[model samples]
Target chain A: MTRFDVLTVGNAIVDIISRCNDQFLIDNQITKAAMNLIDAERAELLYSRMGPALEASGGSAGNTAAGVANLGGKAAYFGNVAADQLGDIFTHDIRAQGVHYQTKPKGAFPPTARSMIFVTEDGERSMNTYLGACVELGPEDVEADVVADAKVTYFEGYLWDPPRAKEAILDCARIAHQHGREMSMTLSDSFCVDRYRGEFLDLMRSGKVDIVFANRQEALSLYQTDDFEEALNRIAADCKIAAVTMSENGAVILKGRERYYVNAIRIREVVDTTGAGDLFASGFLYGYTQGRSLEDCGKLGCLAAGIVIQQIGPRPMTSLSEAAKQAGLI
Target chain B: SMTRFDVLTVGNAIVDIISRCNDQFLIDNQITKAAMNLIDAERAELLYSRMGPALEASGGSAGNTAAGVANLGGKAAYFGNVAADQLGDIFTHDIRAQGVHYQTKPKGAFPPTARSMIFVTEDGERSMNTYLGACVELGPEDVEADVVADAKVTYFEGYLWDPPRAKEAILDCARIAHQHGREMSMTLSDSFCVDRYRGEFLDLMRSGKVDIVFANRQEALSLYQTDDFEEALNRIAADCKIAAVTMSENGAVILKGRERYYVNAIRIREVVDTTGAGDLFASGFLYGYTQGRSLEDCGKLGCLAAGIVIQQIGPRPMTSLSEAAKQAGLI
Candidate 1:
C-alpha cells in the first residue's frame, strides 16, 4: 500500500581500491579484509604512500539504495557528503543509477569519507576508512515525508560509528514505526556489533526492531552465547523475524512458529566480500517486499549473494534485471 | 662508470597483458580493434575484470622500438618507471633479457606501474586500454642528460596526456638531444592522442625539437584534421625534417623537405590484432636509420616489419630483421 519500497539511512562514503601484495599488509600492521578506522593524519600519510588507486563511489547504504533501484524497487536514501571532487563523483554515480538522493552536502569538513581498500593477491580486501564528512550526518537530515511513505526503513549498523548518526537512525526508525511500517537493521560488521552489542540488543528486545540481520559472529556476540543455536533462539524470541547468516554454511531464518535453514548458493569463486551482506539483504528484502514466501526469500538471498562474490567489487556490472532474469527471480 | 649502457631511450613504461579471444569478445567489450583507448582508473578496473588471464609483456610505442633496437645487435637503454611490483619485475626482466639498458627508477610511493590490457582476438586484431600509473610521475627530474647525450637519437612517444610531467620530460629530452647535436624523433601514437595535443605537437615539431615523425593513417588524419590524405601529407612534409606515415596494406609515405617516397606494404596471410603495427614501423625505420639506409629502403623495411607485427600479439614478438632485411635485399 505504500508508495515507496524502502528508505535507507546511513553514512555515505566512497571507496578507493588499490592492488597490494600480502607483504604490504604485514608491513603496515593491518589484518587482511578487516575494516580499520584511521584518523585524518594517518589517512593522509597512508594515502600519500599507497600505490595508484581505482576510486569508486560506494557506501553500505548507498549500495543498498542502488540494489533496491536495480531490483525495480522505489528506494530513497539519506546521508551526507562534502562539496569536493570525490563527493561530486559519488553523487553523480548514485543519482545516475536512478535512486533518490536528497542529502545536502556540507561545504566544511575534512572532505568526503574515503575507504582505502588494499586488495591482496587472493582477492581479499582490507579497508582503512577515514569518516570525514560522513560524521556530519545527524537527525536534521531525515525527511519526515520520505520516511512515512516507505514500507520499510533499513538501517546499517555502521551508522552507530558517529555519535550524531545514532540519533538520526532513531529518528528515521521512530518515524517508520509511527507510520506502522517495519524497521529492518543489519549488524554491518563483527567489530561494529562488538562495540555496540548492549545498545543493539536493547533495540532488538524493546520491540523497536522488527527484523534483525546478523552474521554468525555478530549474532553470537550479540547474545554473548558462543553456541549459534542459543544465539539464534534468543534472537528469534526477541525480534519478530531473525536472519542469521553463516558465510559458507548458508543462513537460518526464524519467523513466527517456524524455523528454516537455507543453503548458500554455489559459487565458483568468492572474489571480493565487499557487498555480500548488502546484496544478501537486497535478495531477501526484495523477495519479502514482493510478498514471496520466507523460504523463497532465503533462497533469493543466497542467489544474490552468490552472484556478487564472483566479481571484484561490491556492485554487479550487469544490471539486476539481467541477473534476476538469469536466476528466474523475475 | 656513470651508467654505461647501449642505446638509451626514454618513453612511457607500460605493462601490456595480452589475451586471446574471438570476435564475440570484441563485441562484448564494446571496443573497436586497432583503436587505443585511454581509460581512467575505474573503467580500467572494469575491463580488467572481464578480460581473462593474460601474458604480461613490457610494451610502449617507443619502449617497443627500444626493445626492437636491442634485439637487432645494438646495445639499447630504456628510461621508464614501473613500481617495484610483480608487473614491474616482468617489464624489467623482459627488457633486460633482450640486452637493453633500463635505468628508469621505480616510483617509491603514490602510483604504481602503468598497465595496458591488450585483447588479441583470433583474427590478430588487437584492442588496447591503457591505465597511466606511475607514468604520470615522470618529469624533467627523471630525464638523464648523459643518457640522452649517449644515444644516437632520443625518441619519445605520444599518448602522454593528463600527466603534465611527461610533457616536461619530452621537452627535456629534446633539449638534451639538441645540446648533444644527435637527433630527436616522436611517434604520434594514436589518433585520439593527436586530438589531445595537436597544438602542442605542431609547436614542438616546428621548433625543431623533432627530426623524424612517425604516424599511421588515423593519426595523420587527426593531426591535420583533414579528410584529404595528400593535403595532410603536404602539410607535414614541409614542417618536419622527415615524416613517415603508414597506411596499412596501402604501404607507407616517406617525405623530407623536397623529396618523398611511397613504399608498398608486404601482404600477409592473416591480419590479427593490429596493436604494434605503428611501433614496428618505427622499429624498422629506426633500425634502417642506424644502418644509414636510403629513405626508400627505410620505408620498405618499416613496411616489412609492420606487416609482420600486425599478424601477432605485440611488436617484435618474432625477430624479423633477418627476414625483413633479406626481403628488402639488405642482408
Candidate 2:
C-alpha cells in the first residue's frame, strides 16, 4: 500500500478554451465574462463557432491534486469519466501530470465533463460547462483505505451540485474521521456557494470540514453579511482552519484562535486566472501538512497562486519546488 | 399626477452569451471594434458556432434598464417576450430576483427569446452581435395598457429594429403613456441602431414622441452625422425636451432648457468588465429621476453606478445600495 499526503475526490473534466471577439459574443447572445452552464447541443454549437482551441484536463479537485503533486507531495485522486475521447484526454492529462488517478472509466452514460472557456484579450474568461460524466460520481467511489492513507482528503464545493456527489463527499468525510485524518474543501466558485449555502453551513458547524477555502465575495455571501471581519470571526469559531482568498489583495488564514494576513505574491503579468484558488489551496495545505506555521502556509499559498496566474492554465508544466525555492519557500 | 414608479421599460427579452477574444477576432471576423451590430439568424448561428464557450444571463436593454431602476430604490416594470424554455426560466429568475415587475409571457411558438453574444477586449470595450429571436413576436397584443400607464415614464431601447412586432409594441406603450398624460423616454442604444432607424427616430423626436433621450457619443454623433460634439448636441437639443449623451471617461453632456452641464465620469480603480456600463448608467439616471434631483445629480448617479459595475461581472445589484448612495452623498 502506498501512502499519500493528500487525496482528492471530485469530477474529472476537460477544459476547451478559445479566444473570441465582442461581435461574435453579441451575435451569439452570450454574456461577457460570466460562468454559464450549457447543454451538449449548445456546447457543440459554440465549439464549432470558436477559433482554435487549447485543451487541458481541469476538474476543481483534480487541479488541486495536480498542484500537490507539483509541490513534490504524494497526491491521489478519485473521479469519474466516460470511456470517450475526451475522457481519455482527461485521464492521460492527470496521470501525465503525476497524480494517482486510478478509477475505471464508465462504459456507458455521458461523456467526460467539459468546460468551454472563452478568454478575452483582457485575460477575463467566460465559462460554459456541461457536467457530463461528473454526475456519475457517488458514494461507491469513496474508498475507505484511500481516505485513511492520506493526511488530508480534499473536495471541491461543486461536488454538491449533484445529489450523489454529496453522498460521496459525506462518505469520504466519515472515512477520514474514522481514520483520524483531516478533511478539506474549497468553495470552488461564488455561484456554487450560493447554490449550496445551507449544506456548507451544516458542514462547517458540524466540524466535519477541517479546512474551508472561500474567496472574498463567497465568504461575504456565505455569512450573508457584507462585512469581511464579521464573516472571518464567524468562520473562526466554526472551523479548525480556514483560508480566505481576496484575489489581488492576497489571502487570510485562520487557525488555532490566531489569524494571519498574507500579502499577494506580485506577478509581472497576469496571463490567465485559471486554477488560482486551486493552487493557493495546494500551497497552503502542503505547508500545513508539513507542520509549517499558519503564516508560512499562507505566504506559500500566495506564492503558488502568483505563479500559476502568470500562465494560461491552472497548473504550470514546471515543478513548484524550483519556483517555491526562488520565492523563499524552502 | 406625479409618477408612482421611477422608470418603466419595454424591450425584447434576451439572454446574454459572453466570451473573451483578442484583437485578431476583429480582423479574422471582419467586425468593427466596440460596435453593436445586428446579426441575422444564420449569421448569429455562424458566429456562435465559431465562438468559444459562453456565459448565459437574462440581459435585454430595457430588462437591464428596469433592473437598474430597482437597484436604485425605484419601482420598475418591464414588457418583453420569452420562450418557455430553460433560458426563459433563467431570464424570469434573474429579473424577478432583482425586484422588477415583468408581466410578459413566453410566445407559444416561433423562436426562443433573443440572445446577444458579447465579446470583451482587454481595453474594457465590448463588441456585440445580437440575434432577435422571440423578440420579433412582441406586438400590440403583448402590451399591457395598465402597466404602461402606471409608471412615471416609459423607457425604450432602439435595438428593436430587427424585430417588426417589437416596434408595434413600443408604439402601443407610448400611446398608453400619452393617453394617461405621462412621459416617454428613449435610448439610442448604439450608433448602428441610429444608422438603421435614422429616419424613424427623426420622426419620433420631431413629433415630440419622447420627452428625454439618452445616447452615447457615437450614437449622438451618428444621429446628427457630424464630427463635432457641439453640432450633435444642438441638433438633439432642438428635437427633444432633454438630451443626455455619455462620453465614456470624459463624462456626459446634458442639455436641459438653455443650460448644459458636463457631468464628470467618476474615476475607477479598474474597469474589469464593461458588461453592465450602459445599464448601470440608466440605473443611476432613473434613481435620480425618482428623487427629483437635478440633471447634474442624474449624471452623477450614472457615473457612480457605472463605476461600480465596471469592476465586476454581470449587473450585480449592489447589496449595499443605501450605503453606496450615502457614501456618494446621493441621499
Candidate 3:
C-alpha cells in the first residue's frame, strides 16, 4: 500500500517576483500573462533591469505538491536543482511545507532554475523562465518504487519541453500503472499544450492518463477547436475524470455522462494568479483521494484556488486545512 | 562649500533577517520581548538554525535614518562597516538603490557582515538579536573629515559604544563636524544603551560635543534616572541645544532653549513593525531642520515619517517619502 497520497514530479524553480507597471512589460517587449523561455544571458540582463524582487520556491507541480501538503495530505516530490544558495532555499521551502523531497543536488549542473515574474498592477504575472539545472532531470532520477507508492502520480506538461524530463514522466507513468495506481497531468500552460497537443491527446485517449487538468485555453487547444462544447465533449470521452477551470467563471468536472459544476469562490482581492491552477488540482486531488463526491471535489478545488490568488506568492502562507474548514469544505 | 549633504550618518551596517514567530518561541529561547540583545557568533548560529524562514533587508539604526533622509529627497551620506560577503552585497545594493551615498569599503576577512535576527511577534513587536561581526572593524580612519565637514549634521547612534573602535570613529566625526561649524546629533538608540553610556553621553551633551539629542520616553527616563517624564524632559531641555523626546502614540515634544513644541502622532492604519520608527523620526526632523523649517514643522514631519515606517515590514519606506509627505501636506 502507498504511504503517500500524491507524488509530484517536475522542475524545481525559484520565483523572483517583483511588482511592475504595464509599461515595464511593454518597454521590455514581454508578452503579457505568458511564460517565455530565456537563456542564461537574457536572464541576467532582465534581472539587472528589473527592480528588487522577493524570492520564493515555485514550479508548476512543486506548487501543487506544496498545496497538497498544506492541506494535510501526504505528498512527495522529485526534481533536479543545483547545489547553490538558491537551491538551498528551494529545498528548505518545500521541505518546510512537510513534503517528502529527497532528490540529490546536481553539483556540476547549471544553477537552480529561476523565473523572473513581473506582476503588474492588474495582478497578472508574466514569467521569464531559465531552465538551468531543471533541464538535467532525466529518467534516471525517478525512483519506480516511489512512483508506484503514491495513489496518484502527478506531472506537469511543462516538463515536456525538457526532453529528458519528458522521458522521465513517461517512465513514471508506466510504473504507476503497473502498480494499479492512477496517473494525472496538468496541461500547465496553453502554449505548452499547443506544442504537444497530439502527444497529449494520444496519452489521454489511449488510457495512459486517468485524470486531466486544464484551463479554458488549454482545453480548447487540446481539442484543436474554438467551440467550448466540442472541446468539453472530447475531454469527457477521452479521460475518466477531467477538471476544466475558467477564470472567474468557475470550473466543470466530467466523468462519462455525469458532470458537476462549481462556482469560483469569491475573493476580495486577486493579488497574483501564478499558481491558481496548480492549487486547484491540489484541492481536487485531495478531495478525490478522500473518496468525496465529484461536486465536493470541484468545490474544494475552487476554494483552494481562491486562497492562493489572494496572496503575492504562489504558495499558501496560511494553513489550507484551516481555510478549508472555515469554508465548510472539509 | 555649500552644504552638499543634509546629514552624514555613521553606525554599524547590518542585514536584518526577519521572521514571524509566536510568543512561545520567545519564552522558550529566553528572549526579552521588545528589546535589542547582543549575541556572540555561537548564539547567532544557534538562533539562525532554529529560526523559521526569513526575509533579508539592510537595517541598522543610523543606516535606516540615512536611507530615510535620502527617501525624503534630502541629500544624505552614510559611513558604516560590512564584510565582503553575500549579505554585505545585499546591504550595499539596497542602500545605494535608495539613493543614499554609500562608499565605505568592505572589510576583506572575518568577522563576516553583521546581521540582526529580528523576530516579529503577532502584535508587531520586534525582538532583535544582533551579531556585531565586522562592525567592530570601524575606526577613526573610516570617518573622512571632508565628508563630515560637507554635511550640515553628523548623526550617530549610541549602539556604536558597544564597539570600542566604533566609539573612536564617532568621536572623530563629532570633532570634525564641530570644527566645520556643523551640528552633531546622537540618538540614545535604546534604554539599555543609554544606561550603559550614561556618563559619557551626559558629557557629550553638556560639553558641546553633541548639539542635538534624540531619544524615546524610556531612554529619556533612563538617562535622567527618574520615574517622572517631566523631570527628564526638563533635564534634557537644559543639557543640549535641542532635544526631541518621542513618546509612542502620544506624540513627540521638541525643545530648543526655553521654547517647547509638542506635535501629535500621525494616525496610521496599523503598526506593523516598530523597529525603524525612531530612526525615521530622526531622519524627518533633521531633514526639516537643515532646510530651516520651524520647530513645530520638524516635529510634525518627524511624526509623519515615523508613522509611515511603523506600518510596514521593513524599516525603510516602501512608498516614496516625498510623495507621502506631499499627500500629507507636510512639504
Predicted model with the maximum lDDT: 3
Which candidate do you rate higher for lDDT, 1 or 3? Answer: 3
Ranking by TM-score: 3, 1, 2
lDDT ranking, best first: 3, 2, 1
Candidate 2 chain B has its poorest 10 consecutive residues by lDDT at: B313-322
Error of 2 at A224 (Å): 29
Query: What DockQ do the predictions score, one after another?
Result: 0.02, 0.05, 0.27
Q: Model 1, residue A314: what's the lDDT?
A: 64
Score chain B of candidate 2 by TM-score: 0.95
Candidates 1 and 3 compared: the better one by DockQ is 3
TM-score for each candidate, following the candidate numbering: 0.65, 0.61, 0.89
Candidate 3: TM-score, chain B only: 0.98
Model 3 Cα interface RMS deviation (Å): 3.0
Residue-by-residue lDDT tens digits, candidate 3, B60-120 = 9999999989989899999999998646765776677677788899868478889898999
TM-score of chain B of each: 0.92, 0.95, 0.98
Candidate 2: DockQ? Answer: 0.05
Ranking the candidates on DockQ from highest down gives 3, 2, 1
Please provide, for model 3 over A1-330, each residue's C-alpha lDDT reduced to its tens digit, 9 standing for 90 to 100: 468899998889988777788999999888888778899899977876776455678998999999999998899999999987567667877886788898888684688898989998788999999999998899889987789889999999889888699888889889999999999999888888889998898888888889999999999989789999999999999999999999899999999988899999989898889899999999998998888998998998999999999876788777889999999988
lDDT per residue (tens digit) for residues B1-331 in model 2: 4665667888878877666678898679877778777788899877765665344456887887788778778888888888775456557766775678877888764586677888877787788788877788888888888888888889898887668877887888778888988788898988888998988898888888888888988999999889998889989999898887888889887887677988888888888668777777877887787678999898888878877777754544434454687898987
Candidate 2's error at B6, in angstroms? 2.1
The best candidate by TM-score is 3
